[PDB]
């Protein structure tokens, strides 16, 4: 019978969660109390980029820590120069509804995705000066949300059909497919060694999947609401998730339960994007309250308000050397911060 | 320093191209199509012309309108509905040929109730404020054929039908029998009373009686967008 098997499964999950709760002895807050204060900073805008028309939905830095790409609701993507505020390239899209953007680690390819359920891959460096469409990837019955690059020929894409899958350029079909989420996933972060990854869904759960293993590796009980953005700690043994419940969390890979929670009484809106720094000492986040709230990775307290935008902020990201923090909002105004 | 000068020149060329794109982009209005599989939404879009979402364009009196037909993902519009916040209007299509005898396969009551619930969900959305819907009542020939064909009465599962009579504001354009005029205005008043429960004077609904093989829908959308923009302009300057 189905009922008996389901009930043994529920006792199995009950004893699993009992073991998980028994595998914890002391919180890190007491250990955190052994550290010195960090200091509050009023870092100001250095440069401002204003080229788009509609809202800005995604952005991605480069491997040189000075080039970046961003995607707008208008249907075009332009590559900025973070130093001299120059528009290196401009590419018009075929679909006007895109909500993700990526930049190749080798600085040769870009990726796009949206409600069209198609993943576009362009070729920045060609024989001709203009940029031409290289490959179109289809096969997802869901709107794309993340299109992070795994290598020069491997792309991992997140879609709204509750399934994530690894792809390939030359063959043009997905190699491996990962399933297990009930709701639609819209978050994805990679690892420094490009061997594992984590994803989040609206079902209030975070799932860690190994690329080589081929199926689910870890499952974490998330927040009380959806997951809007996720990020991976630079060390490689922890990560952080942001939700609409006006609070953020961070977990670790090895121990498999919650480590830290960030929340405040004043903040009520939902988190839109989350990022770390080079040393992982302070955590950056974006809210609907038009300000990019700066947090502390250890004390779990605020550092500075750091405002400057008029509308909802949707994306931000630090460079590979921690030199600047780009930030995109819904008013089509990029803001280089330092 | 010639490299920087050439980079600046390329930036100026890109800026000129972006200025041209902005000039082209500001003269178009975007509409959001919405409906159900049973309704002739495909028929409506096909008559309106003359794998992700579909896009179509049309020109009316030198005004360009972009219409986004929605053939899209799983039936949950909680996250992909946020991108539609600057659209001019929402065109909702409802099939008016679902009698109480055709209830459903295994899910709920008659499809009219499901359409009413869908319309209520669209109306009471949070991100969909300041947007006015253009309600449509499609598939009217079948209703007129079925009201007098027997073997199906909507009063069986709609007890409030016997208490309803045609209003004096009705227009006797069918010229056939007041039963069709009674049913038409019954369903129209039902949709209105579902609609006019909130809004606070920021958006309105415009019911219409149209057929799948109709031709004057173009003028209807033009006239409804005109008033929608005109009222907003009047309200912005404290003139309304």
């Amino acid at each position, epitope marked *: 019978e189905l009922d008996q098997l389901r009930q043994e499964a529920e006792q199995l999950k009950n004893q699993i969660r009992d073991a998980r709760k028994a595998c914890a002895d002391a919180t890190l807050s007491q250990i955190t109390n052994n550290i010195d204060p960090v200091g509050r900073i009023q870092m100001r805008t250095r440069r401002t980029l204003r080229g788009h028309l509609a809202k800005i939905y995604a952005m991605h830095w480069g491997t040189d820590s000075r080039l970046l790409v961003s995607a707008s609701q208008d249907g075009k993507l332009i590559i900025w*120069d973070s130093y001299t505020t*120059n528009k290196v390239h401009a590419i018009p899209l075929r679909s006007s509804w895109v909500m993700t953007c990526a930049y190749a680690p080798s600085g040769n390819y870009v990726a796009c995705g949206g409600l069209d359920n198609i993943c576009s891959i362009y070729n920045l460096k060609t*024989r001709e*000066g*203009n940029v031409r469409v290289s490959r179109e990837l289809a096969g997802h019955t869901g709107y794309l949300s993340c299109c992070r690059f795994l290598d020069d020929n491997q792309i991992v894409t997140s879609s709204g059909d509750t399934t994530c899958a690894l792809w390939d350029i030359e063959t043009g079909q997905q190699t491996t497919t990962f399933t297990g989420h009930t709701g639609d996933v819209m978050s994805l972060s990679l690892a420094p060694d490009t061997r594992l990854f984590v994803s989040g869904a609206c079902d209030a759960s975070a799932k860690l999947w190994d690329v080589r293993e081929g199926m689910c590796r870890q499952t974490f009980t998330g927040h009380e609401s959806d997951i809007n953005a996720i990020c991976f700690f630079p060390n490689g043994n922890a990560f952080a998730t942001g939700s609409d419940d006006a609070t953020c969390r961070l977990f670790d890979l090895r121990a498999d339960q919650e480590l830290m929670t960030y929340s405040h009484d004043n903040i009520i809106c939902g988190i839109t994007s989350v990022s770390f720094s080079k040393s992982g000492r302070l955590l950056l986040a974006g809210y609907d309250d038009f300000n990019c709230n700066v947090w502390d990775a250890l004390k779990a307290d605020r550092a500075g308000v750091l405002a400057g935008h008029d509308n909802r902020v949707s994306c931000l990201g630090v460079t590979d050397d921690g030199m600047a923090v780009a930030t995109g909002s819904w008013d089509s105004f990029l803001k280089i911060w330092n | 320093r*010639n490299e920087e000068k050439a*980079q600046r*020149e390329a930036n100026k*060329k890109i800026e000129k191209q972006l200025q041209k794109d902005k000039q082209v982009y500001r003269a178009t209005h975007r509409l959001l199509l919405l409906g159900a599989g049973e309704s002739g939404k495909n028929t409506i879009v096909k008559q309106m012309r003359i794998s992700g979402i579909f896009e179509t364009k049309f020109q009316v009196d030198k005004v360009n309108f972009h219409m986004f037909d929605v053939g899209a993902q799983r039936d949950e519009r909680r996250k992909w509905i946020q991108c539609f916040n600057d659209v001019t209007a929402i065109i909702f299509v409802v099939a008016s040929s679902s009698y109480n005898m055709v209830i459903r396969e295994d899910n709920q009551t008659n499809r009219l109730q499901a359409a009413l619930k869908l319309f209520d969900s669209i109306w009471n959305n949070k991100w969909l404020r300041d947007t006015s819907v253009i309600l449509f009542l499609n598939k009217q020939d079948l209703l007129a054929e079925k009201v007098l064909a027997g073997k199906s009465k909507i009063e069986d599962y709609f007890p409030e039908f016997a208490r309803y009579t045609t209003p004096e504001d009705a227009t006797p354009e069918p010229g056939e029998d007041p039963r069709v005029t009674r049913a038409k205005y019954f369903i129209r008043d039902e949709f209105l009373r579902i609609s006019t429960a909130s809004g606070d004077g920021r958006h309105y609904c415009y019911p219409h009686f149209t057929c799948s093989v109709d031709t004057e829908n173009i003028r209807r959308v033009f006239n409804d967008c005109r008033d929608i923009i005109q009222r907003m302009h009047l309200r912005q300057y404290e003139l309304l």
Partner: single-chain antibody, 230 residues
Framework: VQLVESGGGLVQPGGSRKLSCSASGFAFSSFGMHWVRQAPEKGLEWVAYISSGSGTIYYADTVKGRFTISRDDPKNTLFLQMTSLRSEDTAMYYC??????????????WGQGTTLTVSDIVMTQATSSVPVTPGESVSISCRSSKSLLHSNGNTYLYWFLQRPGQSPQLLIYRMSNLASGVPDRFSGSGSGTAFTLTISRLEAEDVGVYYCMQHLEYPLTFGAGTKLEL
């Protein structure tokens, strides 16, 4: 990528001539253009420069009143008019394309060229003929009268290594970046006023003439040139 050059020859002094360069196989509307001259017994020398959208038009410092340039994108033609010619301008003419952004490679592809026969920063090569063997190291020197470094940090220096019989190629640009189609057998280094080009392995394709050109100021002057004989 194809460049076809037409015009040139021998005409009486004082007349007017017409040169044309057509680009087929790529979109040149976003490529800056250069016309460069090479004397029969001397090295390369720049003549004229056209911006991407004709916003900037630059003429030779040695002579500019007798040169005029223009281009048409729909017809895909860059053409030159010369009036009242002298015996000085007796050099091969080349039309070259170059695009300028961050991380770009200026002066990538060169044309076949056409023959017509009738101070600023100075760079000279100490040597003129270096006899070597296929398997030893080859060193070529370059000296500049002024420090080529800029405030940004870019060392504007370019080598060509033109083969004796075909169009010049690009090997090392900005003194520290290698080209695409050049085999990994060349290297370059410098300090600001003394620069060197080093070759480890030699084959039959390394015979040619090497050039040293700078882009700090704008005389677009070139080096001397060294011929290799085996």
């Amino acid at each position: 990528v194809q460049l076809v050059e037409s015009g040139g020859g021998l005409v009486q002094p004082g007349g007017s001539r017409k040169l044309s360069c057509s680009a087929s196989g790529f979109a040149f509307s976003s490529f800056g253009m250069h016309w460069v001259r090479q004397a029969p017994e001397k090295g390369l020398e720049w003549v004229a420069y056209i911006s991407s959208g004709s916003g900037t038009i630059y003429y030779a410092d040695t002579v500019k009143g007798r040169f005029t340039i223009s281009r048409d994108d729909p017809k895909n033609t860059l053409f030159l008019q010369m009036t009242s010619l002298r015996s000085e301008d007796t050099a091969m003419y080349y039309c070259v394309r170059s695009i300028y952004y961050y991380g770009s490679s200026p002066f990538d592809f060169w044309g076949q060229g056409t023959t017509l026969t009738v101070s600023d920063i100075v760079m000279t090569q100490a040597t003129s003929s270096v006899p070597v063997t296929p398997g030893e190291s080859v060193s070529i020197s370059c000296r500049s009268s002024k420090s080529l470094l800029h405030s940004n940090g870019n060392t504007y220096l370019y080598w060509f290594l033109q083969r004796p019989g075909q169009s010049p190629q690009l090997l090392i640009y900005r003194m520290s970046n290698l080209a695409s189609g050049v085999p990994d057998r060349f290297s370059g280094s410098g300090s600001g006023t003394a620069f060197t080009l080093t070759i480890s392995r030699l084959e039959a394709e390394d015979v040619g003439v090497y050039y040293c050109m700078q882009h700090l100021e704008y005389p677009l002057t070139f080096g001397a040139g060294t011929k290799l004989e085996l």
